[PDB]
Scaffold this active site. Structure first.
Site, short mmCIF file in Angstrom:
data_model
loop_
_atom_site.label_atom_id
_atom_site.label_comp_id
_atom_site.label_asym_id
_atom_site.label_seq_id
_atom_site.Cartn_x
_atom_site.Cartn_y
_atom_site.Cartn_z
N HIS B 36 0.81 -1.19 0.00
CA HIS B 36 0.00 0.00 0.00
C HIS B 36 0.85 1.25 0.00
CE1 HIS B 36 0.54 -0.01 4.57
NE2 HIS B 36 0.47 1.27 4.35
N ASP B 63 -0.05 -7.46 1.15
CA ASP B 63 0.41 -6.09 1.28
C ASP B 63 1.92 -6.16 1.13
OD1 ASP B 63 0.60 -3.37 1.94
OD2 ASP B 63 -0.26 -3.48 3.88
N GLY B 141 3.14 5.89 9.29
CA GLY B 141 4.48 6.19 8.80
C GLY B 141 5.40 4.98 8.93
N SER B 143 4.63 1.86 8.23
CA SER B 143 4.32 0.89 7.19
C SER B 143 5.52 0.63 6.35
CB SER B 143 3.23 1.40 6.28
OG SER B 143 2.01 1.44 7.02
N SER B 159 2.29 -3.72 7.96
CA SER B 159 1.12 -3.48 7.14
C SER B 159 0.22 -2.43 7.80
CB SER B 159 0.34 -4.78 6.96
OG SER B 159 -0.84 -4.59 6.16
#
Lengths: 4, 198
Positions: B36, B63, B141, B143, B159
Protein backbone atom coordinates in the site's frame (compact mmCIF):
# COMPACT_ATOMS: atom_id res chain seq x y z
CA UNK A 1 -7.43 -1.65 11.76
CA UNK A 2 -5.94 0.71 9.17
CA UNK A 3 -2.76 0.72 6.91
CA UNK A 4 0.33 2.26 8.59
CA UNK B 1 21.97 6.44 0.41
CA UNK B 2 22.79 3.59 2.72
CA UNK B 3 19.74 1.34 2.77
CA UNK B 4 18.96 0.32 6.38
CA UNK B 5 15.67 -1.31 7.56
CA UNK B 6 13.39 1.13 9.31
CA UNK B 7 14.48 4.43 7.66
CA UNK B 8 12.03 6.86 5.97
CA UNK B 9 11.57 7.15 2.28
CA UNK B 10 8.94 9.10 0.29
CA UNK B 11 6.75 7.96 -2.56
CA UNK B 12 6.13 10.46 -5.38
CA UNK B 13 7.01 13.40 -3.18
CA UNK B 14 3.90 12.80 -1.01
CA UNK B 15 3.52 9.72 1.25
CA UNK B 16 6.15 8.46 3.66
CA UNK B 17 6.86 4.82 4.40
CA UNK B 18 9.70 2.93 6.14
CA UNK B 19 12.25 0.57 4.49
CA UNK B 20 11.74 -3.13 5.25
CA UNK B 21 14.89 -5.06 4.17
CA UNK B 22 17.77 -4.83 1.67
CA UNK B 23 17.50 -7.59 -0.92
CA UNK B 24 18.95 -8.48 -4.30
CA UNK B 25 17.51 -9.96 -7.42
CA UNK B 26 20.51 -11.09 -9.41
CA UNK B 27 22.59 -7.98 -9.98
CA UNK B 28 19.62 -5.66 -9.05
CA UNK B 29 19.65 -3.96 -5.61
CA UNK B 30 16.31 -3.37 -3.90
CA UNK B 31 14.32 -3.26 -0.71
CA UNK B 32 11.08 -4.91 0.38
CA UNK B 33 8.34 -2.67 1.77
CA UNK B 34 4.51 -2.62 2.08
CA UNK B 35 2.32 -2.82 -1.07
CA UNK B 36 0.00 0.00 0.00
CA UNK B 37 2.99 2.41 0.14
CA UNK B 38 3.11 2.95 -3.66
CA UNK B 39 2.08 1.71 -7.06
CA UNK B 40 4.34 0.23 -9.71
CA UNK B 41 6.81 2.75 -11.04
CA UNK B 42 6.20 5.21 -8.21
CA UNK B 43 9.49 7.05 -7.42
CA UNK B 44 11.06 6.47 -4.01
CA UNK B 45 13.29 9.16 -2.49
CA UNK B 46 15.55 9.01 0.55
CA UNK B 47 16.68 12.35 1.94
CA UNK B 48 15.28 14.18 -1.06
CA UNK B 49 17.22 12.00 -3.57
CA UNK B 50 15.71 9.51 -6.00
CA UNK B 51 16.83 6.03 -5.02
CA UNK B 52 14.70 3.79 -7.26
CA UNK B 53 11.15 2.93 -8.31
CA UNK B 54 8.41 0.43 -7.24
CA UNK B 55 9.04 -2.66 -9.28
CA UNK B 56 6.04 -4.65 -8.20
CA UNK B 57 3.39 -4.70 -5.42
CA UNK B 58 0.22 -6.55 -4.38
CA UNK B 59 -2.30 -4.62 -2.33
CA UNK B 60 -4.96 -5.35 -1.09
CA UNK B 61 -5.22 -9.21 -0.80
CA UNK B 62 -1.62 -9.19 0.35
CA UNK B 63 0.41 -6.09 1.28
CA UNK B 64 3.88 -6.42 -0.28
CA UNK B 65 6.20 -4.54 -2.68
CA UNK B 66 9.89 -4.21 -3.63
CA UNK B 67 11.59 -1.09 -4.95
CA UNK B 68 14.42 -1.58 -7.42
CA UNK B 69 17.21 0.75 -6.56
CA UNK B 70 19.89 2.37 -8.66
CA UNK B 71 23.35 0.85 -8.37
CA UNK B 72 24.53 3.90 -6.50
CA UNK B 73 22.68 2.72 -3.44
CA UNK B 74 24.57 0.82 -0.71
CA UNK B 75 22.57 -2.17 0.58
CA UNK B 76 23.23 -3.10 4.17
CA UNK B 77 22.26 -6.12 6.26
CA UNK B 78 20.96 -3.96 9.14
CA UNK B 79 17.82 -2.59 10.80
CA UNK B 80 17.90 0.73 12.67
CA UNK B 81 17.50 0.67 16.45
CA UNK B 82 17.98 4.20 17.66
CA UNK B 83 21.65 5.04 16.78
CA UNK B 84 22.52 1.32 16.86
CA UNK B 85 21.77 -1.53 14.44
CA UNK B 86 20.41 -5.08 14.52
CA UNK B 87 22.17 -7.35 11.95
CA UNK B 88 19.97 -9.38 9.62
CA UNK B 89 21.05 -13.02 9.76
CA UNK B 90 18.28 -14.87 8.01
CA UNK B 91 14.54 -15.28 7.81
CA UNK B 92 13.50 -18.15 10.09
CA UNK B 93 9.88 -17.62 10.91
CA UNK B 94 9.33 -17.22 14.64
CA UNK B 95 6.30 -18.82 16.22
CA UNK B 96 3.45 -17.31 18.27
CA UNK B 97 4.69 -16.32 21.67
CA UNK B 98 8.07 -15.28 20.32
CA UNK B 99 9.39 -11.84 21.09
CA UNK B 100 9.76 -9.51 18.12
CA UNK B 101 10.74 -5.90 17.47
CA UNK B 102 9.85 -3.61 14.57
CA UNK B 103 11.55 -0.49 13.20
CA UNK B 104 10.02 2.48 11.31
CA UNK B 105 10.28 6.22 10.90
CA UNK B 106 7.38 7.23 13.21
CA UNK B 107 7.63 5.23 16.46
CA UNK B 108 11.21 4.02 16.05
CA UNK B 109 12.15 0.63 17.37
CA UNK B 110 9.43 -1.13 19.41
CA UNK B 111 9.26 -4.69 20.75
CA UNK B 112 6.46 -6.97 21.83
CA UNK B 113 5.46 -10.57 21.02
CA UNK B 114 3.69 -12.38 18.23
CA UNK B 115 0.17 -13.03 19.39
CA UNK B 116 -1.55 -14.62 16.36
CA UNK B 117 -0.97 -15.59 12.77
CA UNK B 118 -3.16 -15.58 9.69
CA UNK B 119 -5.22 -12.60 10.66
CA UNK B 120 -7.39 -10.69 8.13
CA UNK B 121 -7.26 -6.88 8.18
CA UNK B 122 -10.33 -5.21 6.59
CA UNK B 123 -8.88 -1.98 5.32
CA UNK B 124 -11.07 0.56 3.44
CA UNK B 125 -9.54 -0.76 0.20
CA UNK B 126 -10.28 -4.44 0.70
CA UNK B 127 -9.22 -7.23 2.98
CA UNK B 128 -5.59 -8.31 3.38
CA UNK B 129 -5.31 -11.87 4.48
CA UNK B 130 -2.63 -13.97 6.14
CA UNK B 131 -1.02 -11.28 8.33
CA UNK B 132 0.77 -12.04 11.59
CA UNK B 133 -0.09 -9.96 14.61
CA UNK B 134 2.20 -8.75 17.37
CA UNK B 135 1.60 -6.30 20.18
CA UNK B 136 4.68 -4.10 19.61
CA UNK B 137 3.19 -0.62 18.92
CA UNK B 138 3.39 1.30 15.70
CA UNK B 139 2.23 4.59 14.15
CA UNK B 140 1.20 6.05 10.76
CA UNK B 141 4.48 6.19 8.80
CA UNK B 142 5.84 2.89 10.08
CA UNK B 143 4.32 0.89 7.19
CA UNK B 144 6.75 -1.13 5.19
CA UNK B 145 9.20 -1.26 8.10
CA UNK B 146 11.09 -4.26 9.41
CA UNK B 147 9.84 -6.80 11.93
CA UNK B 148 12.87 -8.77 13.23
CA UNK B 149 13.85 -10.79 16.26
CA UNK B 150 16.76 -9.55 18.39
CA UNK B 151 18.53 -12.61 17.12
CA UNK B 152 18.51 -11.15 13.56
CA UNK B 153 15.73 -13.22 11.94
CA UNK B 154 13.73 -11.09 9.59
CA UNK B 155 9.96 -11.73 10.02
CA UNK B 156 8.16 -9.35 7.69
CA UNK B 157 7.05 -5.82 6.89
CA UNK B 158 4.58 -3.54 8.70
CA UNK B 159 1.12 -3.48 7.14
CA UNK B 160 -1.24 -1.74 9.63
CA UNK B 161 -3.01 -1.86 12.96
CA UNK B 162 -5.51 -0.35 15.41
CA UNK B 163 -4.11 3.09 15.36
CA UNK B 164 -5.80 5.62 17.66
CA UNK B 165 -6.46 9.34 17.13
CA UNK B 166 -2.87 10.24 18.05
CA UNK B 167 -1.62 8.25 15.02
CA UNK B 168 -0.26 5.13 16.81
CA UNK B 169 -1.32 2.39 19.23
CA UNK B 170 1.50 3.06 21.73
CA UNK B 171 -0.83 4.77 24.29
CA UNK B 172 -3.09 1.71 24.84
CA UNK B 173 -1.82 -1.40 26.78
CA UNK B 174 -0.03 -4.11 24.84
CA UNK B 175 -2.97 -6.38 25.57
CA UNK B 176 -5.14 -4.26 23.31
CA UNK B 177 -2.75 -3.63 20.42
CA UNK B 178 -3.03 -5.28 17.05
CA UNK B 179 -0.08 -4.41 14.84
CA UNK B 180 0.03 -6.54 11.72
CA UNK B 181 2.84 -7.44 9.36
CA UNK B 182 3.13 -9.21 6.08
CA UNK B 183 5.31 -12.37 6.28
CA UNK B 184 8.67 -11.98 4.53
CA UNK B 185 9.07 -15.51 3.11
CA UNK B 186 6.24 -15.32 0.53
CA UNK B 187 7.50 -11.89 -0.69
CA UNK B 188 11.02 -13.38 -1.18
CA UNK B 189 9.86 -16.37 -3.21
CA UNK B 190 7.19 -14.42 -5.13
CA UNK B 191 9.75 -11.98 -6.53
CA UNK B 192 12.84 -14.30 -6.49
CA UNK B 193 14.72 -12.02 -4.03
CA UNK B 194 17.52 -12.95 -1.65
CA UNK B 195 17.91 -11.22 1.68
CA UNK B 196 21.17 -9.32 2.31
CA UNK B 197 22.66 -10.79 5.62
CA UNK B 198 25.75 -10.03 7.65
Amino acid sequence: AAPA
Amino acid sequence: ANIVGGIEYSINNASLCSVGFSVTRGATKGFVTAGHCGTVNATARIGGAVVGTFAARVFPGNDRAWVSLTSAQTLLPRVANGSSFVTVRGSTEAAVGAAVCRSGRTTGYQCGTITAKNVTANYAEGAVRGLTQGNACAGRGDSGGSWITSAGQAQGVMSGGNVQSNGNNCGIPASQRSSLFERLQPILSQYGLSLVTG
